[PDB]
């Protein structure tokens, strides 16, 4: 039932057409929770999941977060009209270590009113760049702004998910939002651990080697 | 005039007002042809420049490349609007890597578009994730869709300027659209080899260093 808390994901800037369709087509074979893929696939994505359970989720001002409200809310509406279900957006991590917490809840507040409830919202805090007490503040800023998930990291920083960070994270949000691990999640071991420090969800390329426990093929 | 070839630039997601506020200042001192900042602090940037011949720069679509048309558009017009007068956008590359080549060209056309003479459009191709063919095809579409540059590379996906791809994107545009070399040149005689190749614009972190050729303040 771990295939439920797997978003199947591929978020390299090069890859191809092909390259989503094979994503989705193993979502599809695995009963994956969603792909998540950048915007400009997610109508294909939508195309090859359509009359499926696998929902396409997409990644929004990704990776850097330093986009403006306004163009993070565009990029969402477009999205759902395109297909997602599913929205991962990055956190204006700069604005947070400003100090600047109203456009850092403004930021995620104009992705959630974007959406209008049409698809989930997740929000990548960033970990590796975040103190301790940063990542309390960003989690309680995107509770309050109305965002379904806090997320550990894009993949494309420093560090990925740590067991001490999703607790963390857990402990701030309690039962108000969900909690994605991401980065570094490349095993069936990785994933049980996130998920017993409180992950509901996991952000991976390597989900068919966590579900078949490393027992599948390609498992390498 | 070294000076105004430069793109004085800070892009790093954990960049904070302070920092922007200071490469501001810097460029004023020195008098470089923009700064170039993520859209986020375009207004800021605005504000500090403004009066001065020193041109606010952003980023489209960056650094993937690979949100929707639709969205980088928006973001160009956003941009313009607070206050950004040069935009360099991402390709999009993964749609060039399948070979849709009427995509990869209605994505720059679409940020040709939006800026409509109010801003100046560069196209980073990513020379790193390219074939050489991919290379001269991403530039002979950038000035099929009007733009007014070209630019070897985003600084965070695997590599930089290099004077065999700065003379092969000199050669492939001619005299039909400039050629920025970034990414890596964060010295003088660097800044000098890719100038000698063809390099009519440079983005970088030092311009300080590269225009004082050493004297410049904090040079470590």
New interface residues.
């Given amino acids: 039932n771990i295939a439920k808390m797997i978003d199947h994901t591929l978020?390299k800037?090069?890859?191809?057409?092909?390259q989503i369709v094979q994503l989705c087509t193993e979502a599809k074979q695995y009963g994956f929770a969603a792909v998540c893929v950048?915007?400009?696939?997610?109508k294909t994505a939508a195309r090859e999941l359509s009359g499926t359970d696998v929902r396409v989720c997409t990644v929004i001002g990704?990776?850097?977060?330093?986009?403006?409200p306004?163009?993070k809310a565009?990029?969402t509406t477009?999205?759902i009209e395109?297909g997602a279900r599913e929205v991962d957006m990055?956190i204006?991590?700069?604005?947070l270590?400003?100090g600047?917490d109203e456009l850092v809840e403004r930021d995620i507040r104009a992705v959630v009113e974007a959406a209008a409830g049409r698809a989930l919202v997740k929000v990548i805090v960033?970990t590796a760049?975040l103190t301790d007490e940063e990542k309390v503040r960003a989690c309680q800023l995107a509770v309050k702004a109305g965002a379904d998930y806090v997320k550990t990291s894009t993949g494309?920083?420093g560090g990925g998910a740590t067991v001490e960070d999703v607790a963390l994270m857990r402990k701030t949000v309690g039962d108000r939002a969900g909690v994605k691990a991401s980065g570094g999640v490349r095993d069936w071991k990785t994933a049980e651990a996130m998920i017993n420090a409180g992950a509901t969800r996991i952000g991976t390329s390597s989900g068919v080697a966590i579900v078949t426990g490393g027992t599948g093929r390609a498992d390498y």
Same sequence: chains 1, 2.
């Avoid at 800037?13 to 092909?18: D, G, I, L, W």
């Avoid at 950048?38 to 997610?42: A, D, G, I, L, Y």
């Avoid at 204006?92 to 604005?95: E, Q, S, T, V």
């Fill in positions: 978020l800037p090069e890859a191809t057409e092909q950048n915007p400009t696939w997610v990704f990776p850097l977060g330093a986009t403006t306004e163009t565009f990029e477009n999205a395109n990055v204006n991590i700069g604005a270590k400003s600047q960033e760049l494309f920083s």
